Amino acid sequence: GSGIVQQQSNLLRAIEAQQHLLQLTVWGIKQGGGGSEWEREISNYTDIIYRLIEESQNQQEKNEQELLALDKWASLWNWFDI
Amino acid sequence: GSGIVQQQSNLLRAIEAQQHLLQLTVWGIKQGGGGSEWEREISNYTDIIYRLIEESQNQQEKNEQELLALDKWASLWNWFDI
Amino acid sequence: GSGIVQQQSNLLRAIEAQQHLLQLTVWGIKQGGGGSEWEREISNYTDIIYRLIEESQNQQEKNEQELLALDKWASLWNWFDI
């Protein structure tokens, strides 16, 4: 239960960070390009996003393991019920 | 249960809206810039995305509260079982 | 249970693909535009993203049906408990 709520937090944060990147990209095309500061912010948000993606992949793996274990536990209590 | 399925709907809609922004940004660079209509659509989708992000943050908070309450309820039925 | 973990996988993959598009768009503005290869990669990732979005919409519908059924089942075992 905690793993899924946690994973949803991970995804939400990722899309918020990605929205910031989108804004910077929109700014970039409006301005016909961006200076070093523009590149700095792009880099900063990119770093944040990759960390969130990495953490989400890790959490995804743990959630699937828990699912597999729960599924197996339930399928045993299925056969034993006959 | 409903809170998580609901939150997944929120996130999905957000990424769909963000995909539209991405397309507009791709169009923008291909065209070497965009007119007022391009800016209008960017603005419209940005508004949609921020509303979805806000709603998702709110839903996230409610899901975590429910988790905390459920966790506490379960941990009490843990101690009482001895 | 599987439907939500599965849907989280769908969303994660979508945001990863969308991150690749973002990078290409950033590259595009830095370079003042992109060649045919740039357009090819944009197209490829766009295709991936739309397939993931489609699959996520489908999974969302199934999750909501399961929720509706579970909710109904629980509300019947509510009335019958009096």
Crossing angle for the helix pair A2-31 and B36-79, to the nearest 10 degrees: 160
Contact between A21 and A46 under an 8 Å Cβ cutoff? The reply is yes
Closest CA to A45 of A10, A16, A8, A6: A16
Q: In whole angstroms, what is the distance from residue C15 CA to residue C49 CA?
A: 8
Kindly report the CATH number assigned to the domain that includes residue C80: 1.10.287.210
Total domains, chain B: 1
Resolution of the entry in angstroms? 2.1
What separation in angstroms does the CA of C14 have from each of A55, B80, C10, C20, C55? 15, 44, 6, 10, 10
Name the amino acid, one letter, at A80: F
Phi, then psi, of A80 in degrees rounded to 5: -65, -10
Q: How close does chain A come to B82, measured CA to CA in Å?
A: 24
Q: In whole angstroms, what is the distance from residue B19 CA to residue B24 CA?
A: 9
Contact between A38 and A24 under an 8 Å Cβ cutoff? The reply is yes
- Domain of C1 in residue numbering reads as 1-82
A66 sits in which H/E element? helix A36-79
Structure determined via: X-ray
Contact between C70 and C14 under an 8 Å Cβ cutoff? The reply is no
Q: How close does chain A come to B78, measured CA to CA in Å?
A: 17
Report angle CA A29, A31, A36 to the nearest 5 degrees. 95
Residues 40 to 79 of A: which have CB under 8 A from any B CB? none
Cross-chain residue pair B53–A16, CB shorter than 8 Å: yes
A53 sits in which H/E element? helix A36-79
What's the token pair of residue B80?
């009482």
Q: In whole angstroms, what is the distance from residue B33 CA to residue C81 CA?
A: 65
Contact between B63 and B3 under an 8 Å Cβ cutoff? The reply is yes
B65 sits in which H/E element? helix B36-79
Contact between B17 and B44 under an 8 Å Cβ cutoff? The reply is no
Cβ-Cβ contacts under 8 Å between B and C: the total is 54
